[PDB]
Amino acid sequence: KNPKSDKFKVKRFHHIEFWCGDATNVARRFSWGLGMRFSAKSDLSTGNMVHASYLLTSGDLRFLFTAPYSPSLSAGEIKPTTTASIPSFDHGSCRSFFSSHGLGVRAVAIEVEDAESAFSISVANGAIPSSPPIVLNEAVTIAEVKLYGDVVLRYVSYKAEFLPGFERVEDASSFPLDYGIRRLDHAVGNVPELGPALTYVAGFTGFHQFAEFESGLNSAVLASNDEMVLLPINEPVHGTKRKSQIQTYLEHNEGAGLQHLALMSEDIFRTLREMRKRSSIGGFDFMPSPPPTYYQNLKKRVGDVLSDDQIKECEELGILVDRDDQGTLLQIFTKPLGDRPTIFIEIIQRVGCMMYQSGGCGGFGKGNFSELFKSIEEYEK
């Protein structure tokens, strides 16, 4: 049941912005770890005296990494005279964000038809404003509303190349890495209470609850009209034996924030081979592979879709598999991206639900929880 109640016209995920202390080093580690190319820059070399920002791209995926410069470089400017290419940026907000959360996502940015209209209708429907709409070089407008914790939902709209003031990077510096990652699939938040978060976000966007099918969570998924912008949210469930990983998140993160980003790959086997090659030489580490019993019980549950050739290929890479009633899903999780046990990345491939592929095809692999658990028990036996 998809009511299609978007209060404004939403298109697709546009970019994810990371607030760091040093954008150069984080950007280079991510570039190598995920196979993302250096696409554009705004920094001292482009006249930006306020913040350094570097964009990585892989297919449609856009990762933005930003860190502040000393405020002394831009003490003489005023908001109308600013050299910052992202007008919402603020030194104190950024330093406070990163000292409070460490490395994490500041903005989930979606492209819309009219950013100003999306901001106005949003706040008229209960959104807490973060930065009012601003028009950039009469060409793009950007506005921000609060999403949860210190994460903002950023609206971007174009009249007619990332953002004004940014520059394309030199051919030399830009090496054409690509491990198969193609676009952002969903972005997930951890909150203390799911109800008020769901009520709040649904209420200013009009996103509807996405169709679902006893460890830690309780979650829900808001989705846009075409279900191409998916925004899951988790809350912890207390009093269990194994303490909630969601509560672990909230303690180390100092409150709500973005938990994981799910990236879609065209060939999840090539992605996971190439990412695993680089794990111990600067890239990313993966959550430990599930017991061989798990793969023994996969025949009986996904026999019709996965040949054991493609199946044993998942065993090599430790991939997890789940299926809904319309589709099937391949997924694996990284270890946390930084010092704290907070944000991590999911690589996914969806097969099914062709018409183009419809969003959420296969679900989000929640069954994999119980399945994994069962496997563990069976492999101990």
Instruction: Name the one range near a copy of itself by CB under 8 A: 7-15, 32-40, 125-133, 184-192.
Output: 32-40
Is 51 annotated among the ligand-binding residues?
no
Closest approach of Cβ 233 to ligand A1L4A, in Å?
8
| DSSP 8-state code for residue 267 | -
Give me the sheet containing 140-148, strands edge to edge. Answer: 129-136, 140-148, 151-158, 104-112, 10-19, 61-68, 51-58, 37-42, 167-168
Q: After which residues is the chain broken (C to N over 2.5 A)?
A: 160, 213, 355
Measure the N-to-C terminal CA separation of the chain; round to a whole number of Å: 42
Residue 219 binding target from a copy of itself, Co ion, ligand A1L4A, none, CB below 5 to 8 Å by type: ligand A1L4A
Closest approach of Cβ 184 to a copy of itself, in Å?
20
Closest approach of Cβ 118 to ligand A1L4A, in Å?
25
DSSP 28-59: HHHHHHHT-EEEEEESGGGT-SSEEEEEEEET
Nearer to ligand A1L4A, 93 or 279 (CB): 279
Closest approach of Cβ 304 to a copy of itself, in Å?
36
Indicate if the alpha-carbon torsion angle 15, 222, 185, 101 is positive or negative: positive
Residue 219 binds to ligand A1L4A (criterion: CB under 6 A): yes
Is 346 annotated among the ligand-binding residues?
yes
The number of residues in the chain equals 381
Site string for Co ion, 251-270 (x = CB under 5 A): -----------x--------
DSSP 80-146: GG---SSTT--HHHHHHHHHHH-SEEEEEEEEES-HHHHHHHHHHTTPPEEEEEEEETTTEEEEEEE
CA distance 217 to 219: 6
Closest approach of Cβ 62 to Co ion, in Å?
19
Instruction: Name the one range near ligand A1L4A by CB under 6 A: 77-85, 125-133, 196-204, 368-376.
Output: 368-376
Q: How far is CA 19 from CA 61, 96, 133, 360, in A?
A: 17, 10, 21, 28
Closest approach of Cβ 125 to ligand A1L4A, in Å?
25
Residue 189 binds to ligand A1L4A (criterion: CB under 6 A): no
What's the angle, vertex CA 349, arms to CA 345 and CA 352, rounded to 5? Answer: 145
Using CB under 6 A, which of 8, 97, 294, 364 touches ligand A1L4A? 364
Q: What is the rounded (10 degree) CA torsion for 205, 206, 212, 214?
A: 50
List the interface residues with a copy of itself, window 302-361 (CB under 8 A): 337-341
List the interface residues with ligand A1L4A, window 241-260 (CB under 6 A): 260
CA distance 2 to 9: 16
φ/ψ of 31, rounded to 5, equals -55, -45
Is 186 annotated among the ligand-binding residues?
yes
List the interface residues with a copy of itself, window 82-101 (CB under 8 A): 95, 98-100
Rg of the chain taking only CA atoms, in angstroms:
21
Residue 282 binds to a copy of itself (criterion: CB under 8 A): yes
List the interface residues with Co ion, window 181-220 (CB under 5 A): none
Using CB under 5 A, which of 306, 346, 349, 360 touches Co ion? 346
**Positions that interact with ligand A1L4A (CB under 6 A):** 186, 188, 217, 219, 232, 234, 260, 262, 287-288, 320, 333, 346, 364-366, 368-369, 372
**Positions that interact with a copy of itself (CB under 8 A):** 20-26, 28-29, 31-33, 38, 43-44, 52, 67, 69-70, 72-73, 95, 98-100, 102-103, 172-175, 177, 251-252, 254, 280-283, 285, 337-341
Annotated binding site for Fe cation: 186, 260, 346
